[model samples]
Target: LDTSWKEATLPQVKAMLQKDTGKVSGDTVTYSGKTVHVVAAAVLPGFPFPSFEVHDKKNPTLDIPAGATVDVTFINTNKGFGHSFDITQKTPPFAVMPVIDPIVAGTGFSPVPKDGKFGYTNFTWHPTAGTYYYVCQIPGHAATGMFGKIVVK
Candidate 1:
């Protein structure tokens, strides 16, 4: 197989390629060419305020190719308050910058149930070629390091 990478710096290229050892795994799901799913969570009660806290032992980097659409699922596996799975420019002055503005911005967090059980939401977005962030845009979230980067190729 052949892989072509353009518009990527040396470090970014290296970091990206280092994970793909020309192999595939069950965790990797690709549909209709470069599409993928980003499964993230912030369901730990009292663990931390803002946390990606990937449940699986997988790559921390949420990698996606340029012009690829990603279906992101923000799940609160454990009983906790409202949490959101959104994106940003990864810069300062954090606010509710919705990557998928319509559903993810205003109704970003999970519904507050009476039982305090699981809560989740599914959404999709087409990310441009740049370095953006995946975070929970709850009140005073993101500040406590409940954020990560989504490297769009």
Candidate 2:
């Protein structure tokens, strides 16, 4: 029954998927003689429904050097819904059930609290030279512009 419902909802969910490349920001900080790419991401309520705010910028692309360690902190400020974060090699208009086959290590759907409470999750990744994406793995979320590019060079 659930499978049938999901199948029926697939196309409409696909239709909701879009690529938003309007706002971009790059962030990194040096600590203990090592360069750590810091990604502070949040999901807030607003127009276009919901999306990621990184470095106070909307869905911004992050640039970092090869072999750099990335420190990601994710929080869902929107009390109505929960979201997850991951960095993947997958392109835009992602699958309804998006997979986390990331170029860098991923955070594997960390839990975000709902109902006016606030909490955050942290993860680390060491990536090589490649272009990747940081996205919300929840179905139909990334489709709705909750994603950003990561250029590791």
Candidate 3:
């Protein structure tokens, strides 16, 4: 359907993202003073590779409280395709697609190979109240819905 992020449907995706309330363990991560993992996967079937959806839209939004650390990870679950992760404050009509911003505690965007590896973009940021969006900068991916909002209260 209409997947464009717009004023009419900008709210198309919202608060559905449950406040992550789990605790960190093992390779677990912490966000909003709660344990969370910003994990996503790429999907399949052709030349365009169609969709690179996250958790199958199970958790489209990342609901976080204020002044918490941002621990995120982007994995390629053998989509047999390449992908990359990026977090940006930039919106539509951007002069140029946003570049990979610096994460609070790690290196920037890393390409995801088809072998189910974590992209180098795994990072941690002490985030404050603001608006942000996560997207895949792999060519036309983000433009085709391989993106979602990051809500920080």
- Computed on alpha carbons, the lDDT of every model, listed in order, comes to 0.50, 0.56, 0.46
TM of each candidate vs. truth: 0.60, 0.68, 0.56
Which candidate leads the pack in lDDT?
2
lDDT, candidate 1, 35-54, per-residue tens? 66555556444454456544
lDDT of 2 by residue, 26-113 (tens): 4322222144535444455453445776655677667677776666555555555656667778888777776657435555443344
Q: For residues 35-66, could you state the per-residue lDDT of candidate 3 as single tens digits?
A: 45554444422323534434344225666677
Stronger candidate by TM-score (1 vs 2) = 2
Q: How close is candidate 2 to the true structure, as a TM-score?
A: 0.68
Ranked by lDDT, the better of candidates 2 and 3 is 2
Q: Model 2's lDDT to the true fold?
A: 0.56
